[PDB]
Ligand binder design. Structure first.
Ligand SMILES: C[C@H]1O[C@H](O[C@H]2[C@H](O)[C@@H](O)[C@@H](O)O[C@@H]2CO)[C@H](O)[C@@H](O)[C@@H]1N[C@H]1C=C(CO)[C@@H](O[C@H]2O[C@H](CO)[C@@H](O[C@@H]3O[C@H](CO)[C@@H](O)[C@H](O)[C@H]3O)[C@H](O)[C@H]2O)[C@H](O)[C@H]1O
Ligand SMILES: OC[C@H]1O[C@H](O[C@H]2[C@H](O)[C@@H](O)[C@@H](O[C@H]3[C@H](O)[C@@H](O)[C@@H](O[C@H]4[C@H](O)[C@@H](O)[C@@H](O)O[C@@H]4CO)O[C@@H]3CO)O[C@@H]2CO)[C@H](O)[C@@H](O)[C@@H]1O
Ligand SMILES: C[C@H]1O[C@H](O[C@H]2[C@H](O)[C@@H](O)[C@@H](O)O[C@@H]2CO)[C@H](O)[C@@H](O)[C@@H]1N[C@@H]1C=C(CO)[C@@H](O)[C@H](O)[C@H]1O
Ligand SMILES: C[C@H]1O[C@H](O[C@H]2[C@H](O)[C@@H](O)[C@@H](O)O[C@@H]2CO)[C@H](O)[C@@H](O)[C@@H]1N[C@H]1C=C(CO)[C@@H](O)[C@H](O)[C@H]1O
Ligand SMILES: OC[C@H]1O[C@H](O[C@H]2[C@H](O)[C@@H](O)[C@@H](O)O[C@@H]2CO)[C@H](O)[C@@H](O)[C@@H]1O
Ligand SMILES: [Ca+2]
Ligand SMILES: [Ca+2]
Ligand SMILES: [Ca+2]
Length: 637
């Protein structure tokens, strides 16, 4: 507002959105010009302080006033960080006489921060389609039986002494007395996925599909791989995969699509020939003979009964990656005919992988989260991106996955449990994703989101897998107590936040379910139509996100965090649009004066709540909109 020995925090802003960063994914030779925003005439000077990993030192770049925003309310200060190959971390020092403030990935600060700085990873690139798409996850057996001839039947076969049980579509997922939950089948398959492709890409609008394991394995989840080179017979054959991939990539049935596979590379099933615990193959596996040609693919403490595994499960023997150039690293990703490259190269050309239990991948039976583990995911990236630079790499991780993403040498993104799923669950349903009592206020929710968003490079943020539920946690509908309205707010949010909106099959209509395996129920297709309130909004929302780049790659600015009325409003914006999102997490209606001036929405200009179609006019920097309890508006211009 003026030069008064006071830096006004409310006027301050910056992130790597279009208005502030002219190069968010630069090469070794591209300069990064940054723009800081402040209330007009509020400061005396500003500077950029960045740490360059090339010489391990802090560098200084004084900023200069660049311009005013259309409403003459803000000042934009600029500075440029020189182009080089090295990773850089920056923050801002803001001065107004005797007052000094700092700003970085975590927003304003009275004292100088030492963490949460903004990133500059030269030559690091996350595929843009992932950044701008909407994903739909499918647990094969439970989506749609499109071919009843490949169905696993009761007794069809046995695993570790247990016969398989077949369920009627819609029945409980729990095994009946005498059977195992891992050996319960409903019939979902690849042909089913292909036949319902119209529901995916059109009825909903999603353009990205992510499949849980689909390779030869005895269980129903299939994380106990028996053969990476073959599609499990129950889901079809490799030929079926090809037709599906072609039908997904096809733009003759809707938006061009991308397929992402589940890569279970940390371990193998105990029935995989390399191990062959039950001797299902003539060859000799590691378990049967210390002279086995694959003996060293695993780690034994006391051969053959005690060996390394995934969290103690004997059915999932841990793979030993050894050192660079090892046979294992070759069969998984180095060899041209490896698991990762085989499916990434024709005649399959899938578009990416979901790294299951990626934090554990290691050598000699160790648990990862160490140097070797990271060295491995670095070679993995060179192998993948070497075959196709636009093939996505998303690792599974429940906490801060900064160690595997913050240097642009490993994954493109990660399963956003901590930055999306948990905060959303606790804010809307008052439970954590495992359905335990855990509630947070709007203020707390907005902070939680900013802190976790700051853990990652901007392009990683835009590529994070944001789901309300997934195959390992309780369903949102159950955590909601059945209140379909909470699902409405959740959807509206999910489709307007930073990151790849990811729909866990069934969530779009309000499916319920507890802990594994009850969170993997068969899909109720009578509810899969626009006649369902939730399904309709999902589609409405998806259409809206695809309409505005500002929602996929724009900036994010908090506008309202009211704990009294439980209202949360934020804005997504770029060079073309300004979107004010208003959310009501209360159980009663509220009239909100949305301060759209913060997004520089001109007075007299009109805005439209793309959810209702109702138009509004910006007067005195505000927009008054009434919103029902557990719902929201999407004011766009
Ligand atoms: C399931 C999940 O467990 C870990 O995740 C931790 C996480 O790291 C922690 O930070 C914290 O948040 O807690 C979670 C767990 O809630 C692990 O790190 C993850 O990698 C793992 N998820 C992936 C890996 C698994 C192995 O490939 C997959 O699970 C499959 O295999 C499991 C083991 O048999 C099956 O688990 C069943 O669990 C029930 C318990 O209700 C048991 O009774 C039953 O015997 C088990 O079979 C599961 O059904 C399979 O899907 C998982 O799907 C991957 O996503
Ligand atoms: O889970 C891993 C950790 O991830 C997060 O740490 C991030 C920070 O949030 C980022 O801001 C950034 O930090 C840079 C920092 O910006 C830069 O100035 C420089 O900082 C130190 C340097 O590390 C240290 O060796 C010494 O030289 O002093 C410098 C300044 O005094 O380097 C930092 C990182 O190299 O990156 C880190 C990690 O990528 C999160 O905040 C942590 O909680 C988490 O543990
Ligand atoms: C910012 C912070 O938000 C979340 O933390 C939650 C806690 O989980 C909850 O128990 C309670 O304390 O409220 C907090 C909200 O502030 C999130 O779970 C954290 O991960 C996140 N923590 C920062 C980000 C990183 C990711 O974990 C950490 O590495 C870092 O040290 C934190 O500053
Ligand atoms: C340098 C000056 O730039 C900005 O001023 C511009 C206005 O915003 C425009 O509307 C138009 O009038 O052009 C002006 C440029 O001449 C900015 O708003 C100012 O705050 C800024 N001046 C600050 C910096 C100085 C250097 O320390 C101080 O002397 C001065 O008091 C500050 O206000
Ligand atoms: O009745 C269903 C409806 O209830 C709520 O609406 C509130 C309204 O917002 C309050 O201001 C007041 O009028 O009571 C109404 C009902 O008691 C919810 O806001 C909404 O979710 C729900 O559909
Ligand atoms: Ca001032
Ligand atoms: Ca079938
Ligand atoms: Ca054998």
């Amino acid at each position: 507002a003026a030069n008064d020995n006071n830096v006004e925090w409310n006027g301050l802003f910056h992130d790597q959105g279009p208005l502030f960063d002219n190069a968010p994914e630069p090469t070794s030779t591209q300069s990064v010009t940054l723009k800081l925003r402040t209330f007009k005439g509020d400061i005396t000077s500003a500077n950029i302080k960045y740490w360059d990993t090339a010489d391990n030192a802090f560098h200084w770049v004084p900023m200069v006033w660049d311009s005013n925003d259309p409403t003459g309310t803000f000042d934009y200060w600029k500075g440029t960080i020189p182009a080089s190959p090295s990773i850089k971390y920056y923050r801002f020092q803001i001065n107004d006489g005797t007052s000094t403030a700092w700003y970085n990935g975590n927003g304003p600060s009275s004292t100088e921060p030492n963490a949460d700085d903004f990133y500059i990873i030269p030559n690091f690139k996350t595929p843009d389609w992932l950044k701008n798409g909407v994903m739909y996850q499918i647990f094969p057996d439970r989506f749609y039986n499109g071919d009843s001839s490949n169905d696993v039947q009761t007794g069809s076969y046995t695993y570790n002494g247990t016969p398989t049980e077949k369920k009627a579509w819609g029945s409980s997922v729990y095994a009946d007395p005498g059977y195992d939950n891992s050996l319960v089948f409903f019939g979902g398959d690849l042909a089913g996925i292909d036949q319902k492709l119209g529901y995916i890409k059109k009825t909903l609008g999603a353009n990205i599909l992510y499949l849980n394991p689909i390779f030869k394995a005895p269980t129903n989840h299939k994380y106990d791989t028996q053969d990476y080179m073959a599609v499990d017979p129950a889901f079809g054959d490799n030929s079926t995969l090809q037709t599906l991939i072609n039908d997904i990539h096809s733009t003759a049935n809707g938006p061009k699509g991308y397929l992402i596979l589940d890569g279970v590379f940390n371990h193998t099933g105990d029935s995989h020939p390399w191990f062959d615990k039950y001797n299902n193959f003539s060859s000799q596996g590691a378990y049967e003979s210390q002279s086995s040609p694959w003996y060293n693919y695993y780690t034994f403490y006391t051969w053959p009964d005690s060996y390394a595994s995934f969290l103690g499960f004997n059915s999932l023997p841990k793979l030993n990656y050894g050192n660079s150039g090892s046979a294992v690293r070759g069969v998984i990703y180095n060899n041209s005919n490896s698991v990762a490259k085989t499916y990434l190269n024709p005649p399959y050309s899938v578009d990416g992988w979901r790294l299951d239990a990626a934090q554990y991948v290691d050598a000699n039976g160790n648990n990862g989260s160490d140097v070797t583990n990271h060295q491995i995911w670095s070679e993995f990236r060179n192998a993948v991106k070497g075959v196709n630079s636009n093939a996505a790499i998303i690792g599974e991780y429940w906490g801060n996955a900064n160690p595997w993403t913050a240097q642009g040498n490993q994954w493109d993104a990660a399963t956003n449990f901590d930055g999306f799923t948990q905060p959303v669950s606790e804010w809307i349903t008052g439970k954590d994703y495992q359905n335990n009592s855990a509630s947070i206020s709007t203020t707390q929710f907005d902070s939680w989101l900013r802190g976790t968003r700051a853990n990652y490079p901007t392009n990683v943020q835009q590529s994070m897998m944001n789901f309300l539920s997934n195959h390992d946690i309780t369903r949102f509908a159950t955590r909601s107590g059945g209140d379909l309205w909470k699902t409405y707010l959740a959807l509206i949010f999910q489709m307007t936040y930073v990151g790849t909106p990811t729909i866990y099959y069934g969530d779009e209509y309000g499916m319920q379910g507890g802990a594994d395996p009850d969170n993997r129920r068969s899909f109720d297709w009578s509810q899969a139509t626009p006649s369902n309130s939730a399904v309709a909004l999902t589609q409405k929302l998806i259409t809206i996100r695809n309409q505005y780049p500002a929602l996929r790659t724009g900036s994010f600015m908090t506008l309202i965090t009211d704990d009294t009325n439980k209202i949360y409003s934020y804005g997504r914006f770029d060079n073309v649009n300004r979107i004010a999102v208003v959310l009501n997490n209360d159980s009663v209606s509220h009239t909100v004066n949305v301060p759209v001036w913060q997004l520089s929405m001109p007075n007299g200009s009109t805005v439209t709540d793309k959810i209702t179609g109702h138009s509004y006019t910006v007067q005195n920097g505000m927009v008054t909109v009434a919103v029902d309890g557990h719902y929201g508006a999407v004011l766009a211009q």
